[PDB]
């Protein structure tokens, strides 16, 4: 796969697309939870050579626009994109579940604590500008889930559904990794899946990003000590806890703070 | 057959069961009590077979007599499981649940009517009197009705730990069976649906009714839900579903609801009760 | 068929309880996997006393599989050929090798870390993964690591029994719910009253008694301690701390018990 194809403006999407390539979707039927404006669908179809891509989104206008972008960005593969229409939260319509049940791989880069602070505004404008062009939501809470203790409730809710509807399907998801890979792997093991980390990158966190959640979390987990994972350099050589990274920023407003993003595949037994 | 407008929670449950499509099915009810729902499911719903159990060991025998009177024709077709059965936690109960197409229940939950235990007490001793026994006041279950072991459940945070506990058991023991449960909906329909989705079931709301909550009902539990933080310690949006009118047109938060009763202690406050069927994939 | 009293561990009442439950479990002729093999004594016990057909297992520390192998060979030479440990640093069963073995096992067994374990077990002299299991619903009673194992055993070996050793200060209703919440029908195979080491911290259990329910909201809950060794006189966790306060050397007891979780099935 060539370098040009991975999103060059958003490291999270880039991390997610380099992992989808490594996942090996060629000839498979894939389902994307949260297609948005379909750029990832175009990528999976044109670059990963997926046989069939379906998907849905919470906002029901996006399916229309995803199709449009796919026709424009992957015209020779566009006929293989069959979105599920409607306002679909996770996979919660009969239509969505039917297609999920027929999928080999379910993929998603889903809301989570630690996501870029501007991702919602971005997503919203993105819609509009395409929704002709040529406010919700509402991004739910999923507070009941055990792994919402580390900000991953929505991702756990999806795994509960995937296991039930498509028990033999892989599930490939993108994650901020400040809580560490043991926690990330536990999310999958708790829910019937063997995790494999397909890919990871050190990414720059936007200036002014609030990391108070991660500082509080690592205070709560000490008894060996648990520490959140941040980095002081883009090579990820200088390690920092949430507390040290916040301390750095308290001093120098312009301090560069880095963290990992990584794609993990869950595979059932 | 009258519905008894005195007990809207039960009326909602039974209307839901009628809609669940139990005809020719084999049903297990968790918490049979004196068997009124059993008789309803046999006589009105036309279930092929009904079984069930109760935490109070004295109720299966009493329920057995009672359905005989209530539904003399099809009073067999009812085979209760004996003993003090919590949820379905005996080998006889599990064996019957494994053979059932549908498990139904109107189970203890935060937000249940405050007079629910007194009503069950009175219903049992009424039943024992119709059966011809002049008994002592031994128609009340004592400690057990435990809550502690259900406290760890994710959905215990919204008062439904016991219901989630049941879903863990029904999925394992009868992976193909529907589970049809009655709920007070003060915590919201979306939360009630997540209870099923989180545990392997696709929920469908069979029936719902707006019901008036008793004047002295404390609702600070639901107010606290609206002020609590997420598990993350970050602020959370959470709005409970109350209403101001018996048609359910005026919506009210728990905070809003508690304001009115602070203003006018006599104010009427309503909420939804709904029957939700969980269906496995 | 004499009771093999000689064979049970005389040194550790927790291990003694485990082994007594393991003989009651009926492992004869079966394929058994032990999480946390340690030195291998339990394996030797299961081979030589329980007549397991085959035994495998793993430990978090990769230098212990070899040591276990050594002691199984020295303690059960004529059965040690039935021991096939999984090498490597294996947390729970989280390698492909471990997983393949578990999937072929009739029974998974373990005496796993948990809040309330003796303070000295940690020391070796021969946890540590822990934070990742903080989110489990039963970590509220200090059993999150055990809950994590039950999530894996159900998925990897949905037909296998799981036999686990437990301190029962939180009481048997809670211990049984850990299994019922996770797809297993529990059965208490064996239990004993043990003496907790003078000076053991039970702040955790006192906190459980003074806690508002998750709701929450009132919660009436009492831990199970004992004042004697026959478990005749009951004590709450608060009452037990109170005594340790009155006496530095007050003797405090609690139950240890072995529970088998059987899928249903
Ligand atoms: C902006 S992305 C999530 C952020 C993530 N950190 C990232 O960079 O990819 C959100 C997309 O997923 C969709 N989405 C959000 N919540 C969803 C849900 N619960 N179910 C399905 N789609 C959802 C949104 O409509 C939007 O198209
Ligand atoms: C307690 S009521 C609840 C009724 C429901 N809230 C309503 O308002 O209509 C239902 C029956 O369940 C029984 N019950 C209570 N706890 C139980 C448990 N853990 N397992 C089984 N049955 C139980 C009670 O004896 C009673 O007979
Ligand atoms: C802490 S000791 C057992 C504590 C237990 N409560 C007791 O009283 O015996 C755990 C044994 O299992 C192993 N072990 C500890 N944590 C483990 C883990 N996360 N996965 C697999 N084995 C583990 C250790 O090497 C040790 O051999």
Author numbering:
A (entry chain A): 13 to 146, 158 to 246, 251 to 296
B (entry chain C): 16 to 296
C (entry chain B): 11 to 136, 159 to 297
Provide excerpts from the study:
MmtN is an S-adenosyl-methionine (SAM)-dependent methyltransferase family enzyme. MmtN catalyzes the S-methylation of Met, in which the methyl group of SAM is transferred to the Met molecule to generate SMM. Recently, diverse marine Actinobacteria, α- and γ-proteobacteria were shown to initiate DMSP synthesis via the methionine (Met) S-methyltransferase enzyme (MmtN), generating S-methyl-Met (SMM). We propose that MmtN uses the proximity and desolvation mechanism for Met S-methylation with two adjacent MmtN monomers comprising the Met binding site.
The electron density map of the MmtN-SAM binary complex structure showed that one SAM molecule was positioned in the active-site of each MmtN monomer, mainly through hydrogen bonding interactions. The amino group of SAM contacts with the carboxyl group of Glu127 by forming another hydrogen bond. The electron density map of MmtN-SAM binary complex showed that two glycerol molecules were located alongside the reactive methyl group of the SAM molecule, indicating that these two glycerol molecules occupied the Met-binding site. By comparing the structures of the three monomers in the MmtN-SAM binary complex, we found that the conformations of three SAM molecules were slightly different from one another, suggesting that the binding of SAM by MmtN may not be tight. These structural observations are consistent with the biochemical data showing that MmtN had a relatively low affinity for SAM. Moreover, the Helixα5 (Val131-Gln140) shifts ~10o in different monomers. When superimposing the structures of MmtN and the MmtN-SAM complex, we found that Tyr160 formed a loop region (His158-Tyr162) occupying the binding site of the adenine ring of SAM, and the mutation of Tyr160 to alanine greatly increased the Kd of MmtN towards SAM. The overall structures of MmtN-SAM and MmtN-SAH-Met were similar to that of MmtN, with a root mean square deviation (RMSD) of 0.27 Å between MmtN and MmtN-SAM complex and of 0.23 Å between MmtN and MmtN-SAH-Met complex.
